[PDB]
Amino acid sequence: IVLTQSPASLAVSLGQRATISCRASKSVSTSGYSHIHWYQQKPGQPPKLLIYLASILESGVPARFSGSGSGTDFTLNIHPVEEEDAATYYCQHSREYPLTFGAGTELELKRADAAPTVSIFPPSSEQLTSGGASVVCFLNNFYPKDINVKWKIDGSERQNGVLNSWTDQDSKDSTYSMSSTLTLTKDEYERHNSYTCEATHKTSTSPIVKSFNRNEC
Amino acid sequence: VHLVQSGPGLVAPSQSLSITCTVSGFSLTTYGVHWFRQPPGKGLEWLGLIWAGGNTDYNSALMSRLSINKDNSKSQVFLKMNSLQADDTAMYYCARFRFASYYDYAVDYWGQGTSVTVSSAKTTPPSVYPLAPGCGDTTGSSVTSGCLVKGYFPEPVTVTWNSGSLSSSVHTFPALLQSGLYTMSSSVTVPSSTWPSQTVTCSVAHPASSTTVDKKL
Ligand SMILES: C[C@@H]1O[C@@H](O[C@H]2C[C@@H](O)[C@]3(CO)[C@H]4[C@H](O)C[C@]5(C)[C@@H](C6=CC(=O)OC6)CC[C@]5(O)[C@@H]4CC[C@]3(O)C2)[C@H](O)[C@H](O)[C@H]1O
Ligand SMILES: [Cu+2]
Numbered sequence A: 001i002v003l004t005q006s007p008a009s010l011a012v013s014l015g016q017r018a019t020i021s022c023r024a025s026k027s028v029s030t031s032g033y034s035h036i037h038w039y040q041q042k043p044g045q046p047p048k049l050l051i052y053l054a055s056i057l058e059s060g061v062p063a064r065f066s067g068s069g070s071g072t073d074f075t076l077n078i079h080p081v082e083e084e085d086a087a088t089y090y091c092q093h094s095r096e097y098p099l100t101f102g103a104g105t106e107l108e109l110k111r112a113d114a115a116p117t118v119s120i121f122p123p124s125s126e127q128l129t130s131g132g133a134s135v136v137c138f139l140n141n142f143y144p145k146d147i148n149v150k151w152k153i154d155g156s157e158r159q160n161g162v163l164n165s166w167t168d169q170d171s172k173d174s175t176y177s178m179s180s181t182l183t184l185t186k187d188e189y190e191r192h193n194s195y196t197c198e199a200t201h202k203t204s205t206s207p208i209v210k211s212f213n214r215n216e217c
Numbered sequence B: 001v002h003l004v005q006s007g008p009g010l011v012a013p014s015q016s017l018s019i020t021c022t023v024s025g026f027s028l029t030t031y032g033v034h035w036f037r038q039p040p041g042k043g044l045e046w047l048g049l050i051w052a053g054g055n056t057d058y059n060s061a062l063m064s065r066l067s068i069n070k071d072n073s074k075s076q077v078f079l080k081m082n083s084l085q086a087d088d089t090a091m092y093y094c095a096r097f098r099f100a101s102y103y104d105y106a107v108d109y110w111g112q113g114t115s116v117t118v119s120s121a122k123t124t125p126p127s128v129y130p131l132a133p134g135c136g137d138t139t140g141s142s143v144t145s146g147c148l149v150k151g152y153f154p155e156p157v158t159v160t161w162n163s164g165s166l167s168s169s170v171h172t173f174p175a176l177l178q179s180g181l182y183t184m185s186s187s188v189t190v191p192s193s194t195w196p197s198q199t200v201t202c203s204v205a206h207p208a209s210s211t212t213v214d215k216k217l
Helices: A125-129
Strands: A003-006 A009-013 A018-024 A036-041 A048-052 A065-070 A073-078 A088-093 A105-110 A117-121 A132-142 A148-153 A162-166 A176-185 A194-200 A208-213 B003-006 B009-011 B016-023 B032-038 B045-050 B056-058 B066-071 B076-082 B090-101 B104-110 B114-118 B127-131 B142-152 B158-161 B170-177 B182-191 B201-206 B211-216
Touching: A003 A088, A009 A018, A018 A036, A018 A088, A036 A065, A048 A065, A048 B104, A073 A088, A117 A194, A117 A208, A117 B142, A125 A132, A125 B127, A132 A148, A132 A194, A132 B142, A132 B182, A148 A162, A148 A176, A162 B170, A162 B182, A176 B170, A176 B182, B003 B090, B016 B032, B016 B090, B016 B114, B032 B066, B032 B076, B045 B066, B045 B076, B056 B066, B076 B090, B127 B201, B127 B211, B142 B201, B158 B182
Parallel strands: A009 A105, B009 B114
Antiparallel strands: A003 A018, A018 A073, A036 A048, A036 A088, A065 A073, A088 A105, A117 A132, A132 A176, A148 A194, A162 A176, A194 A208, B003 B016, B016 B076, B032 B045, B032 B090, B045 B056, B066 B076, B090 B104, B090 B114, B127 B142, B142 B182, B158 B201, B170 B182, B201 B211
C-alpha cells in the first residue's frame, strides 16, 4: 500500500491538541481490524510504539495519545501536547507486505520568544599545532529557531568559512541552541585581534554580541 | 541488552554486510525479529522479518540481495546484505515482533541501531579540541565549556561529559559533512566551581576507527 501523512510539520502550544492524519492507498482493514501503527521517533533515538492496530495503546504510552479510524483514513490525537512530545511521528500499515511507513509529521511546540545566551571560544593550542585556528560560538537556548550569526574579524570585516549547526527542539524547555565555527588558518588567525560573534534574533533589533581580543597572543 | 545490533561502520561498495542483532529478555523460540533501516535524514524502511519458526518474509525489492538467519541458542539474528550500493547507507535497526494472533501483535521493542556507511573511503579518527572561556570574566554561577570534534569519517561519534555523569545541560550540535569529512561539537554548562578544579572531560568514542580519546579541559 502507500501511506500519506499530513501535516508534514506541525506546531501547537502546550495544552493544545495535535492531529496527525494518515491515509492509505487501500483499506488496510481486514474484518474489524485496522492494521496500522503509530511511532514516536524523538530527535535521535529508535522509534517508540505509541499505538498498534490503530487504536490499542502500548502500555506505558500515556493516555493523551489516541488513535482512530477505518479503511483508508486514520488519525493520532495528542492532547494535551506537553513539551516532551516534540518529536517526529510515523504511521506504518501491516496489511500486506511490504510494510510501508508514511513520511513523518514533525511536531514543534510553540512557546514564548526566548533570546540567546551567546558564548565565544578561542581555538585550542592543540589546534594551532596542526596549523589551523577555530573560533567557536554557542548561541544557546533561544526560541524561535531563526537566528543568523555573523563573524566580525578585527574591524567590521565579515568572513566566509563558517559552520553553523542547530540542535533540535529541547524536550524539557522548548528551546534551540546553535554552534557557529569560524575556521581560519593559524597563519592568518595570528595576525588579527578582535573576533566578534554578533547574533541577530527577533527578541531585539540590537544584535547580541560576544567578542574576544587575542590576549598575549 | 534488550536488542542491540553490531555489524558496522564502513563497508566498501559491492562487498557484503552482516549486522548481528542480539536479543535479551525473550528468545527467538517465541519471538520474531524485524530488520528496518533509516537512510540518513529520510523515512524508515522495512527489510524483512524472520518469524518464530525460522520462517522469513522479505521486502520484495531488496529481496534478492538479503538474507536473515537466526541462531536461537545464541540469541542472535544476522542480516546478510550483498552487493552493497552507496544508498544502503543507513541506520540499521532490529526490532521485536510480539505476535499473539492476527488481532494482537506489535513491533514493540527496538534496537538502538548501528550506522553503516557504504563508500570507498577510509575512516578517519577525529581531532578533539577543548573550548574553555579564556579571557577572564567573573562567570556568574554557571560556565559553558565545549569539545570540538573535527574531521572524522564515517559517522557516528559519541561525545559524553565526565564519562556520562553530566548529561544535564549538555547540548550536542549535529554533524556536518564538510569536504568529505564530518565535524560536530557539544557544550555543557556546569557551575562556577564544578568547572575549575572539578576537571571536566569529554570522551569521544569514534567507533569505526576505535578512537576513544578523552580530552581534559
Ligand atoms: C484468521 C484469519 O485472519 C485474517 O487474515 C490475516 C492473515 C493475512 O490475510 C494478513 C494479510 O496477508 C496478515 C499476514 O499474513 C501476516 C502479517 C503481515 C503479520 C505481520 C505484522 C508485522 O508487523 O510483521 C508481520 C501479522 C499480521 C499481518 O500483519 C497480516 C494482517 C492482515 C491479514 O489480512 C490478516 C482474515 O480474517 C482471514 O480470512 C482469516 O483466515
Ligand atoms: Cu504500491
